[PDB]
Structures are given as C-alpha cells and as structure tokens.
Design a protein around this nucleic acid. Structure first.
Ligand SMILES: [Cl-]
Ligand SMILES: [Cl-]
Ligand SMILES: [Mg+2]
Ligand SMILES: [Mg+2]
Ligand SMILES: [Mg+2]
Ligand SMILES: [Mg+2]
Ligand SMILES: [Mg+2]
Ligand SMILES: [Mg+2]
Ligand SMILES: [Mg+2]
Ligand SMILES: [Mg+2]
Ligand SMILES: [Mg+2]
Ligand SMILES: [Mg+2]
Ligand SMILES: [Mg+2]
Ligand SMILES: [Mg+2]
Ligand SMILES: [Mg+2]
Ligand SMILES: [Mg+2]
Ligand SMILES: [Mg+2]
Ligand SMILES: [Mg+2]
Ligand SMILES: [Mg+2]
Ligand SMILES: [Mg+2]
Ligand SMILES: [Mg+2]
Ligand SMILES: [Mg+2]
Ligand code: NA
Ligand code: NA
Ligand code: NA
Ligand code: NA
Ligand code: NA
Ligand code: NA
Ligand code: NA
Ligand code: NA
Ligand code: NA
Ligand code: NA
Ligand code: NA
Ligand code: NA
Lengths: 56, 81, 82, 46, 143
RNA sequence: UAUGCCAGCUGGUGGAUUGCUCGGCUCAGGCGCUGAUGAAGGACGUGCCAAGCUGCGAUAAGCCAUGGGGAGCC
RNA sequence: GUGGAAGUCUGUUAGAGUUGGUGUCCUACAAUACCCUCUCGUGAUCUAUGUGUAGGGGUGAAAGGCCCAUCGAGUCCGGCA
RNA sequence: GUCGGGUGAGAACCCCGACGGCCUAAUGGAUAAGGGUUCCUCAGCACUGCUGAUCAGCUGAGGGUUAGCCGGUCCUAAGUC
RNA sequence: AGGGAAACGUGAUUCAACCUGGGGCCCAUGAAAAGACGAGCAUAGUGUCCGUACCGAGAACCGACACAGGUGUCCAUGGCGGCGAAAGCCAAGGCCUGUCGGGAGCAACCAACGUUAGGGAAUUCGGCAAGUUAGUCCCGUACCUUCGGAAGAAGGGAUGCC
RNA sequence: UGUCCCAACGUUGGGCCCGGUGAACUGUACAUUCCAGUGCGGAGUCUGGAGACACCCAGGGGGAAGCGAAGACCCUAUGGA
C-alpha cells in the first residue's frame, strides 16, 4: 500500500480541537493538552524565545 | 440576570401546532429547563402549561414547544401580541 | 400520404451495440428525402420507435414498413408503424 | 459524529457568519465577505 | 414542469418505490401544482397518480423440473456439480439411518417380540453399523 | 497577392512611470506595573434591518454623576 | 463403521496479500492508479475502536524497514545573514 | 439510451410517458467516524458543474432536528490525569 | 385496537434469529465494575440536562478536485441455478451522474479482443504472451517416503432429454 | 498453441471531420535545407557548391549531440554524514 494517497483515506480521527483556553484549534483531545498555549500541561502560557529571531 | 422567555417563535410550522394542537413555540434562553420554561410561560400569559418540549437550534438559541391545557386556547393567547 | 418500406442495411456501419439509435436516424433521413421535407419536420410516432427497439439496442430489423403523411403550412411528415 | 451543545453553538455561529453583506450596507457605504466558507471547499476548526 | 418532488411524495404516500409511481402524462400541470401530501392523495384518488405492479418470478418451469427430480429424473452424472458427500451429508445420513434402526428395535421390544437381551444385542450391533437399513435389520432378525 | 515581415496610426490589454500619502522605519523627551475586589488572553453574545471591524456585556456601539462643549446627533 | 483432528487441502465466501504481464497509464483517474494473472484464506489469521512506546530515542519474524508523500537518525522554529 | 411530450427567451443531457438497458454484499436498506447545514421550500444563473442547463451538493432568502422507556449520561478495561 | 380495494386461510417441510444441551482442546485458561435478583401490592407525584437535519460516498468523509484511490458495522434466508454467501439470468429497491455531444463501412496507427489453413517452440535469455486441461461418478494409479504422504499421480470409461 | 514460418480478416474504444469546453511542456536570435569542408577535434547559421515558389492536412519519429534532472560513474575540496 502506498504511504501517500491510499493512506490518506483512513484519516477520520479527531485530535486537535478548539482550545477552551486560547481558542486555537490545537487542543489535542486524546492528550487533553494544547499544542499552542500549553493548556493542560502548564498553568503558565506556552511561549519560547525561538518563536522570534534571537535579537528581536 | 437573564430572562427565560425571549420571544415567540412564529413560523408556518409553529402556526400549525398552535391551530391544530394548542401549542405555543418560543425562543427561550438555552440555560432554561423545561420546568422553568413552563413556569415563565404560565406567569407571562396566565395559562395552564401541560407539556414542554425543547430543542437546541442551529441558530444558537433554544426552542420550546409548549402545549396548553384544553382549558386554554393558543390561537387566542398568541393573537394579543 | 403513402406506405413506405425503409431499408436499414446502413445501420450496420455503426457499432452493433447502438443499431437502434442509428436506425431511428435512418428512418428520419429516409422520410425527409422521400417526402421532400426537413428532417426537423419529420415526426415519428412511438410505434416506429418500439419497432426498432423490439429485440434490444443491438438487434434492429433490416427493413420496416412505415406509413407517412405530408402537409401543413411549413411542411412536415407524421409517421407510424403499419 | 456526536456534537456537544458548545460545538453546535460554534458551528451555528459559523453558518451565520456565512451570510452576505446586506444590500443596504452597499448603499450606506457607497461601495465583499472575505470570510465566506463553503462546507466542501473549506474546513472549520476543532 | 418538474414533478420530481411529487414523485418522492407519491412514493411515500402510495408506499411504493419511486420507480413504480406513474403520473398521468396528461395531468402534469395539475400534478405540478400538487404541493402537499394531501394534494397527492387527492390526485391519487382521482387516478392521476398510480403505482405500477411489482413482478414476481414465475416458478412454473421450476415446478416442472421439481417434479421430474422428485420422480427421479434429470439427476444423471452429467447433472451433478458438487461432490457426492456434498449432495448428501454422510454424517447426516447415518444419523438418519441409525435413528430409524433404533426406533424399530425400540418398538419390537415394547411390542414383546424382543426380550431386553435380544434387543440389547441388536442395538449394540446397529451402533456398530451392522445393518445397512431397517429392512436389512428385520431381515437379519429373522435368523 | 494570399499566409506573412518591419515601422507607425486608432482602440485594447497591462499597470510601469510621474504626481499624491491615512502607513512604515529611526531618533528623542515623558511615563511605567496588572491579577483571587478573578487580570491579561479567548469564547459567545450585543444594532430596526447588521456579514466584517470597532465598542460594549443579558443595564450589551451602551446606564449615572460632575465638569467641559454646543445645535446638532444616532 | 463411527468420530471429526489439522499454523491441512480446493476455494475471486468475506477478507488479507501482491507473482508475472516487465501490459494500460506514465503533464495519470492516482505524487504508487487500472486490468488479467497469482498467494493466503481456523490461524504465528484478518479487522474496527480505544490505548502505550518519541528522535541518537521508539518500533523492527532484520529490509537500515517503519515512526503522517519526510528516515544510514522525523518534523517545526531558533542558533542563522 | 430512443420516440413522443411538458416547461421555458433558450433544452441531447430539467420534468412526464413509453420502449431499451445498468446495479444484486451492491449502484439497494440501516448506520460508526468524519463532514457541518450540505437536509426542505421559494427565487435565480455572474461563480461552481470536464459540453449545455430552465437543473443542482452552486448563488440568495426563508424554514427544518420535539424522547422517563434510542443514544449520551452511570460502571468499570488497556491505560490517562 | 390497528391496517387492507378485497379476502382478511389452513396444514406441512427445511428451519437465520432466539432458547437449551452433549462432546473435544490448552507448555494458550479465555475482563472488571456499576447495576439486577434475592425482597409484595394500591393510588398519586416526579422523570430535569445533552444528541436527534442530512451525506455516509465512482459528487456531502481523507486524498489540493463533483479524484477509477482509501474508508468500520448490520442486512449471509428474495427466485432459478448449483456444493456454494460461486457463475450466469431475474425480482424488490436504486439508477441511466463511473455525466460532453454530432458525423464518416468509420483509412493508416494504437488499446482491449475473436478466428485463422499446413507446420507446431523453428520464436525467445527463457513458451514471455496465449493456449491446453477442467465440474461429477466408476475403474485404475509408478519412483520415492519421515508410512502421514506421494495421489485428483498417470491412464481408461461415463455424463442430455423422454 | 498465431511465440515463429507469415501474416489476414473481423469486433469494441480511440484515432479522422463537425459543435461546445480548453490546458501543459518548451522558446538568445535567425531559421526551405542537402552534400562536403572547416571550426574547442560531433555545424540548419562559418567556407564552397548543390537544391529550394508560399501555405496547409495526416503520419511514423532520422536530426536539432530534441525535452525532462547544476552527472549517480570518475577525480578535486585541508566538504558532510
Ligand atoms: Cl443516537
Ligand atoms: Cl447429545
Ligand atoms: Mg513515510
Ligand atoms: Mg431533547
Ligand atoms: Mg441558512
Ligand atoms: Mg465421516
Ligand atoms: Mg490452511
Ligand atoms: Mg486456498
Ligand atoms: Mg490501534
Ligand atoms: Mg544493507
Ligand atoms: Mg436538495
Ligand atoms: Mg427549482
Ligand atoms: Mg434521521
Ligand atoms: Mg462524477
Ligand atoms: Mg494454425
Ligand atoms: Mg530455439
Ligand atoms: Mg533463434
Ligand atoms: Mg503464462
Ligand atoms: Mg551555402
Ligand atoms: Mg555537476
Ligand atoms: Mg560513489
Ligand atoms: Mg566524516
Ligand atoms: Na431568534
Ligand atoms: Na469541509
Ligand atoms: Na507609562
Ligand atoms: Na456589522
Ligand atoms: Na476409526
Ligand atoms: Na497484481
Ligand atoms: Na534526531
Ligand atoms: Na537556522
Ligand atoms: Na449530462
Ligand atoms: Na438457492
Ligand atoms: Na491471435
Ligand atoms: Na525526429
């Protein structure tokens, strides 16, 4: 079976959903953790410095 | 504080229920239970509510189908508004 | 008006699984020519159709006697089985 | 699929947001809905 | 005119497949104006709308064949397709046979013709497949 | 002299150019904490008609007081 | 004779697999497709859903296979001009 | 598919009838996931539809989902917080 | 009661569902908890909350597309056929939307395919491709063998209808 | 047994003509070439001759060292893994 097109057919699972905390569709409903704001893992909001050029 | 009754849901189907089944249809706040819908209705129109059916609509609001006792007449209650 | 025998030997030039259709066309082309009329004015009563489609879309009879009449203000023919 | 009361509310808003700019606004502004979302061509969140 | 909506309606009211509902070709206009189920029933009662009859497969030729076969014909080597044990399940047939034989012996005992010792003997022999059929058994019984 | 070549003329296509700037970029002075009295952020609401933006929060493009302001406004 | 065992046999039952045609296609219907052919088909079977293992780490009846068209070290952004 | 016919400014492909066919573990019936209003009605053709369209899953406006006894809800599984 | 225009049957066979048993297997032992029963009856009151449209696929899902791909369950008892949930034909139900059409005996060429006299693998790396054989019953069956198998060995015969 | 001797005829869909729809690849310029020669030794464009009226349709693909891919082979780099 091709890992391409023919393997695209089984993708009827729901994972990342609208996050109750930040409103982005990144709340992983299996993990109960948001990939965007960290809701469900961190009380503090997710944020890293590599999200921007070092000097900015 | 929010009010239970929002406004009368008037549509062809609502009419048929009022004319043929003695039922009044309302747009009610979605946090309202059938019982709350019942009381509010009786108090607002002075009638006897027999049964209430609810349905959360694809319009973002809750719809309530309220049936009045044979004693009361929906057609008349609705005609005064 | 008259009674005419239409040859459908030329329907074999068309792929066999579609003889009916072609015959049906041949019938219209025949009349139009023999009754000096436009193929647009030629009306074929459904009898004619059911005759051509009798044994399926692939088995059309080699001839067909057809009764036609000619007239009106633009000119036309109406036809049927016999 | 089984949707929840909250979900249903959202899908609902989206459907509404999918109406066209009323004619009167055209006149009142002397003269497009950039948020038009087809159910087949577009994909909603969640 | 477009009577497609009605078609779906007639089919539900007539309680039949859409493909079986017929609309009188001369009353399209009237049928076109039909908008409510009631309007349909009405056109139905006027015979403007009817339901075609559903066919059933004729079992005539089937029955003729069934007779010839029940009488023993059309079952030659050239008419068999499955293996033999396929046409008749050997285990099933032994159950058929052994039960018949066990019933037989059962009667003769109660009947008195057989002492519970002769019976025992024959039963045990049957269970050992000594008798091809009940007929064979009776035959053996008679010395 | 068809098909056609080169240049131009009229019209078009296109949106360069010139002009314009409600936006940026940079420097400089001032100022500088918010949150369980539930913030920041988000969601959903909220208009006569209201899709977006803004505002606002079931008292919902708003309610009150005081000052200013002024014949206009929504 | 009975019995009905088997990583048993035939088998396009369903389902799974993919040998040859080096056919068709090869700006495709398709970033791995179509057809015929072929294998397995009561078992170390096939399958849905849920759930666990994460990047020098997994997973691997081992082919350096696989870990979302990405693998002799995934992807994203940063170090980075 | 064909012959008639209906509607329409306009009809090979929108609708009716007949004739002729196609699908039989599916091209039928009920559904999970997923989609998200695509469902119904009216009004339309600038977009979308491998041609056309009076049709439409398109454009626009309205309307539509009613449960003590179907699901969720409750319980506990691998396992998760 | 209901439903049917009407009649509004009776018996039978085979019997999915459902029920209830017996046997056999394991260096494999085939969940748990809530709940129910155990523990009667009358009358009355209460039974809120969330889901409910539609598609479910060669156009409503995933695959950038109205994509020839991919995508789970139940209907496995509709008829003939036959071993059969097989072929082939046909119902019920669905469809003419695997959605551009018109015309030329319609050439060359190509894709799928049928038939080819005599010869019969001379073709080719190679019988690649195609073809031959074929279902059922009866007879009959070698070397070899781990005695299980080899074996449907091979070979010979039969086969319809009335 | 059409694999072959050695091919023929036929079937269906294309192909061809017409209505409608309507891309892509590719493009320094010029360009009707052919035979020779010459040139960085593999020229439609240089040199010498020959031939050559323009346009269009269909074809099978000889040539444009045809199009497609900053050669995987080989070597080089005080490259990587
Ligand atoms: Cl449900
Ligand atoms: Cl038993
Ligand atoms: Mg991969
Ligand atoms: Mg409800
Ligand atoms: Mg709407
Ligand atoms: Mg046995
Ligand atoms: Mg086996
Ligand atoms: Mg097998
Ligand atoms: Mg799994
Ligand atoms: Mg290796
Ligand atoms: Mg519709
Ligand atoms: Mg319409
Ligand atoms: Mg439903
Ligand atoms: Mg299609
Ligand atoms: Mg020969
Ligand atoms: Mg040789
Ligand atoms: Mg040779
Ligand atoms: Mg072969
Ligand atoms: Mg020269
Ligand atoms: Mg290079
Ligand atoms: Mg190397
Ligand atoms: Mg190294
Ligand atoms: Na409302
Ligand atoms: Na979508
Ligand atoms: Na400050
Ligand atoms: Na607005
Ligand atoms: Na034995
Ligand atoms: Na294959
Ligand atoms: Na790594
Ligand atoms: Na970087
Ligand atoms: Na069409
Ligand atoms: Na049968
Ligand atoms: Na041949
Ligand atoms: Na060439």
């Amino acid at each position: 079976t091709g890992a391409g097109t023919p393997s695209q057919g089984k993708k009827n699972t729901t994972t990342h959903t609208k996050c109750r905390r930040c409103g982005e569709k990144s709340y992983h409903t299996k993990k109960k953790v948001c990939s965007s704001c960290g809701f469900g893992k961190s009380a503090k909001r997710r944020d890293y410095e590599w999200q921007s050029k070092a000097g900015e | 504080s929010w009010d239970v009754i929002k406004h009368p849901h008037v549509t062809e189907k609502a009419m048929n229920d009022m004319d043929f089944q003695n039922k009044l249809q309302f747009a009610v706040d979605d946090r309202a239970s059938k019982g709350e819908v019942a009381d509010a209705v009786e108090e607002q129109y002075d009638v006897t509510v027999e049964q209430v059916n609810t349905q959360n609509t694809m319009d973002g609001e809750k719809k309530a189908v309220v049936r009045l006792s044979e004693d009361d007449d929906a057609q008349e209650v609705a005609s005064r508004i | 008006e008259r009674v005419v025998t239409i040859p459908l030997r030329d329907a074999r030039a068309e792929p066999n699984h579609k003889r009916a259709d072609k015959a049906m066309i041949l019938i219209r082309e025949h009349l139009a020519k023999h009754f000096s009329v436009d193929e647009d004015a030629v009306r074929l009563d459904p009898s004619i159709n059911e005759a051509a489609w009798a044994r399926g879309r692939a088995n059309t009879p080699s001839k067909i006697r057809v009764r036609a009449a000619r007239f009106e203000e633009e000119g036309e023919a109406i036809v049927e089985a016999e | 699929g089984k949707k929840s009361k909250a979900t249903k509310k959202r899908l609902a808003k989206l459907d509404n947001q999918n109406s066209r700019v009323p004619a009167w606004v055209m006149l009142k502004t002397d003269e497009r809905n950039h948020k038009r979302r087809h159910w087949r061509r577009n994909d909603t969140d969640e | 005119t477009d009577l497609s909506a009605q078609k779906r309606l007639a089919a539900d009211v007539l309680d039949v497949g859409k493909n079986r509902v017929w609309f009188n070709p001369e009353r399209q206009g009237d049928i076109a104006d039909a908008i409510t189920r009631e309007d349909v029933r009405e056109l139905v009662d006027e015979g403007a709308i009817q339901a075609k009859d559903k066919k059933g497969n004729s079992r005539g030729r089937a029955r003729e064949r069934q007779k010839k076969r029940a009488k023993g014909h059309q079952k030659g080597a050239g008419s068999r397709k499955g293996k033999a044990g396929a046409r008749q399940n050997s285990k099933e047939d032994w159950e058929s046979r052994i039960r018949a034989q066990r019933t037989k012996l059962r009667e003769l005992r109660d009947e008195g013709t057989l002492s519970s010792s002769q019976y025992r003997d024959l039963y045990d022999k049957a269970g050992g497949g000594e008798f091809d059929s009940v007929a064979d058994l009776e035959r053996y019984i008679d010395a």
